[PDB]
Assembly symmetry: C2
Homo-oligomer: 387 residues x 2
């Protein structure tokens, strides 16, 4: 078999899946920005990903890009939809417009193509859109990729999940296995809405674990105990494990805070205590961390390197104590009404307490006034949440 697979959306999810599949099939990437299409056809990646750049430049891929929808979709066996979406927790609004625009375009241009949605979508989306438009050729498949390592994660995936139980779903999973380096990849075929719920439940469990080890750490600090001794002893249970057990100022990033809230909204009519507590626990942890810093009565608090630490900053400022930020990557002189300080020595001298997500050799000099609850941030082989 030698199929045609079109990628609609050339961000890391679409491009890593396109490059993976272009090792063995015909892949056409659709993007309206001519400069990106030209880059791609010149074998230059528009995104930062070492392996995508290497594969595009060095391997014989049957890959091309076009700005033309008809050229892209015609005769495609599968179309991977990987366009941008966004969930807003304040309004419980999930913007799926880009995905719905591609479903409209593919249905019009090639109604026989099978669409595989890799974009993040709300639970129930695919069953509902199929019913709404009266079409059957849409399947959801979650992506488990890290930005920056997206082709690597497709070459060595944790698992492949396709949200339809059928031969055409299995042939798509086979495309993903054929291109991968990892062998015997766990493969699961589910119904649609169940597949759409997997990442919310997996990401909410990871947030739960960060929140739980952070409550263990709140207790250890309150009781004058050594958090690392307790966490190491707990995590030596093989059913618990030495991963995602690094105390912090709270879970953060662009995923866990939103997914935990999205899942909680989906529980509006389902009795629960854990789902709601995962969200509340992060606010409580940030309050506990800010209260600890404020108890030291600092006149100025310094933040060494720059999302949960921003929540701590908000609480310190709410008490009228100024915050200064050391962050070389930042060019502006102010961030959220707080001064950004360029000279490290000046920053260390002015800050009465320096808060950070990781101890750094640069702060050894002033360790006595450094407050961090991090335990594993300098162990490069340790697996935990980072944002």
């Amino acid at each position: 078999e030698f199929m045609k697979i079109t990628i609609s959306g050339t961000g890391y999810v679409g491009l890593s899946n396109g490059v993976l599949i272009a090792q063995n099939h015909e892949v056409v990437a659709l993007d309206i920005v001519q400069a990106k299409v030209d880059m791609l056809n010149q074998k230059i990646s528009p995104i930062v990903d070492k392996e995508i750049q290497e594969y595009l430049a060095e391997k014989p891929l049957n890959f091309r890009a076009t700005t033309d929808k008809h050229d892209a979709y015609r005769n495609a066996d599968y179309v991977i939809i990987a366009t941008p979406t966004d969930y807003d927790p304040k309004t419980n609004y999930f913007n799926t417009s880009t995905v719905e625009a591609v479903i409209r375009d593919v249905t019009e241009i090639n109604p026989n193509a099978v669409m595989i949605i890799k974009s993040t979508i709300p639970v129930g989306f695919t069953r509902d859109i199929k019913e709404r438009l009266g079409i059957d050729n849409v399947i959801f498949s979650p992506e488990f990729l890290r930005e920056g390592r997206a082709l690597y994660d497709n070459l060595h995936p944790s698992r492949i999940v396709i949200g339809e139980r059928s031969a055409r779903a299995e042939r798509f999973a086979d495309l993903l296995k054929e291109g991968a380096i990892k062998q015997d990849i766990p493969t699961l075929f589910t119904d649609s809405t169940e597949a759409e719920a997997i990442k919310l439940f997996a990401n909410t469990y990871l947030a739960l674990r960060v929140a739980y080890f952070n409550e263990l750490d709140s207790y250890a600090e309150s009781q004058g105990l050594n958090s690392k001794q307790i966490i190491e002893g707990v995590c030596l249970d093989p059913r618990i494990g030495n991963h995602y057990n690094n105390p912090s100022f709270g879970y953060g990033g662009y995923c866990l805070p939103k997914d935990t809230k999205q899942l909680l909204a989906n529980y509006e009519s389902v009795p629960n205590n854990i789902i709601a507590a995962i969200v509340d626990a992060n606010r409580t942890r940030k309050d506990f961390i800010a209260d600890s810093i404020l108890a030291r009565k600092p006149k100025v608090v310094g933040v060494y390197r720059l999302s949960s630490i921003q929540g701590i900053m908000k609480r310190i400022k709410a008490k009228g104590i100024p915050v200064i930020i050391y962050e070389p990557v930042m060019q502006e002189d102010e961030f959220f009404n707080s001064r950004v300080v360029r000279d490290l020595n000046a920053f260390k001298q002015e800050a009465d307490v320096i808060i950070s997500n990781r101890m750094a050799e640069e702060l050894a000099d002033v360790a006595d006034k450094v407050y961090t609850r991090d335990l594993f941030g300098n162990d490069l082989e340790h697996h935990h949440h980072h944002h």
Copy 2:
């Protein structure tokens, strides 16, 4: 080295540690019941444990039992305290009298013996008793043993944790490693109160995991989704894993319900949401399960085999619906005011809904009226909570 180790308490924890150590050192088990001492000296185990029975009867162990405290404790290098204790959640009372009696006896008879407490004790116990009595020769070491497999778990331990950082603590850990079959066992030395907190935090995390997958299952039932599809996809994340993810009527047993409450009481002055929610979540799950069964409007509910299922029974009875129990191991005709039915066919015929923790071939006959949320109870290699 050839030491003398005395075991004070001959239940599964003390006897499995004594038999393990008697392969290479001199072990003396103290028990006031002459019949048990005689059994032990006749190489007969007073408890049910296949490996303890086999080792006592077939291996050349330097092991003996005595009812005499002086004979037992004199010249001991270490005394392992493994006497019964109990925590009552309603009153937040931890009865440690048996341990304190042994500490009194050893201090009087052999003040140079180093006591290793394996009995379960409250967080802070050892630091406080050492200060109270003005003694230094007491160290806590958690036990991670399953009743019935206790010698096996000492021969293949998850880890060894000793709550003192010292050479005499390390020599005791070496005794445990020398007797084990498993090699390179993870070994951790901590301070005292930290060691005492490990099992509460480990067991509360396992309860948290049962509670979380049970809330996922409440959602799947409410939404008409397939719980197994979602759980399998979630647990294929290697940071989550396919263990302790079996939906149930609630976590139970003699450990998780009490430890979660004991830990929550220890958080009286520590801000938290997750610790309190683990306890509340179990009540909410039992309410959800009972409500589901009551929605089917049964006139009689049957319980197939006989702690969380007891909570479901309480809720069904509170609504005035009778419950009948099928449990061959039970000889009485009534349990908590509910009839126990001896004939399976009669039980199946009378029960309008049959609830159980596991589907059984015996119920295939009446699967349409069987309600169970179990997914992995018949997979003998699957690791999850069971009570």
